[PDB]
Amino acid sequence: MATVAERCPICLEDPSNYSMALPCLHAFCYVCITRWIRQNPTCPLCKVPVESVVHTIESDSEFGDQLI
Numbered sequence: 443m444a445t446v447a448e449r450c451p452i453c454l455e456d457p458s459n460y461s462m463a464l465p466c467l468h469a470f471c472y473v474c475i476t477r478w479i480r481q482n483p484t485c486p487l488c489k490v491p492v493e494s495v496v497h498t499i500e501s502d503s504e505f506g507d508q509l510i
């Protein structure tokens with residue numbers, strides 16, 4: 443199989459984390475693609491009228507509070 447990067451069709455700054463646009467599970471960086479479709483739907487990679495985005499990312503938990 444090919445388990446290598448998926449060079450974001452939106453940013454392409456090494457798509458480290460992942461946001462898979464469903465039901466065509468193309469993995470863009472965490473919710474990068476989301477931004478793209480909202481303005482330009484029909485997936486940048488396979489012109490599908492996207493439904494949801496799943497973020498099966500690891501070891502997260504940033505910030506302290508909400509503002510400070």
Ligand SMILES: [Zn+2]
Pocket residue numbers: 450452453454455456457470471472474
């Ligand atoms: Zn990206």
Ligand SMILES: [Zn+2]
Pocket residue numbers: 463466467468485486487488489490
């Ligand atoms: Zn797609």
